Amino acid sequence: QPISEEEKEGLIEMREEEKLARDVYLTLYNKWKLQIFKNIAESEQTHMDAVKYLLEKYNIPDPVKNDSIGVFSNPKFEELYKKLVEKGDKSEVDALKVGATIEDLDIADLEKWINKTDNEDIKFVYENLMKGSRNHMRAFVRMLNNYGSNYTPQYISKEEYEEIISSSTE
Amino acid sequence: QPISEEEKEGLIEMREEEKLARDVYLTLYNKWKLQIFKNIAESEQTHMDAVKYLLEKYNIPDPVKNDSIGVFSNPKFEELYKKLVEKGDKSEVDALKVGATIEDLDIADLEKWINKTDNEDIKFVYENLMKGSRNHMRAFVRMLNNYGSNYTPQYISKEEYEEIISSSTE
Ligand SMILES: [Zn+2]
Ligand SMILES: [Zn+2]
Ligand SMILES: [Zn+2]
Ligand SMILES: [Zn+2]
Secondary structure, eight states, X not given: OOOOHHHHHHHHHHHHHHHHHHHHHHHHHHHXXXXXXXXXXXXXXXXXXXXXXXXXXXXXXXXXXOOSTTOOSSHHHHHHHHHHHHHHTSOHHHHHHHHHHHHHHHHHHHHHHHTXXXXXXXXXXXXXXXXXXXXXXXXXXXXXXXXXXXXXXXXXXXXXXXXXXXXXXX | OOOXXXXXXXXXXXXXXXXXXXXXXXXXXXXXXXXXXXXXXXHHHHHHHHHHHHHHHTTOOOSOSOOSTTOOSSHHHHHHHHHHHHHHTSOHHHHHHHHHHHHHHHHHHHHHHHTTOOOHHHHHHHHXXXXXXXXXXXXXXXXXXXXXXXXXXXXXXXXXXXXXXXXXXX
């Protein structure tokens, strides 16, 4: 029941991964003004706060030294932020696909970390986060459907992607 | 008294230059929490709005399609935003020097554009903006002085820099 360095590394990654979702969705909201990005950004702020509560619980240094949109300590996220906002700027459909894409990445990463921890505190937050992301994914894809488009998964398997989109809400 | 294409190009540049100041100062405020960046960011929002009123007056397409921090249509500003936030992240003194630096650039550019226009509407906004920037410059440099530092001008001349800092407020 003490936390391991590995479990700390997971929380540090997820704290900024939820920020990546929040910041890309804010940025795309300011561009396209589709309410889904505003709504889900707020949910990502909730998710960020959930990770932060665990960071504080274990007195782990918060990787978010600057809450400004686009700012990250781990450059994998700074890179993804730049990549994804450039793709999302092209059209409403490209922005919705970027939404699905971030949810796809986040679900895959949440599974990765869930599987490395036996910690009831941590597992619980991750499960809740994953339930959230599956709902975000369903929301983005349904919106892509309204535009006569769809989504091809990149990080999660085809099979898990189909199980997410063929079900209702959690 | 009609506006020229050249005068339009000036307003389009300044609209995003004031955004550059605003966004860098927001970003540095979120990092360092020095009240000067919050205070002056608000002034830059006022300046942004002043340019926007002229853009609307002449129905010039606003270059700001996305108000999110860090987002620019003219890449000279996207580049300066990245350069300057990286420099400002290093220390409080480096952030204050970045403040002075943006004010320096903005004053030089405002002089450039002021000198290309006979338009009373435009000249007036630019003069007001310049009075603002000179006040921001004095505020940043005084803060650098509190940290035992100072500022070397990059864009304006030494002589105009000395005339700004040796005077009181406008
Ligand atoms: Zn999330
Ligand atoms: Zn999400
Ligand atoms: Zn200004
Ligand atoms: Zn200024």
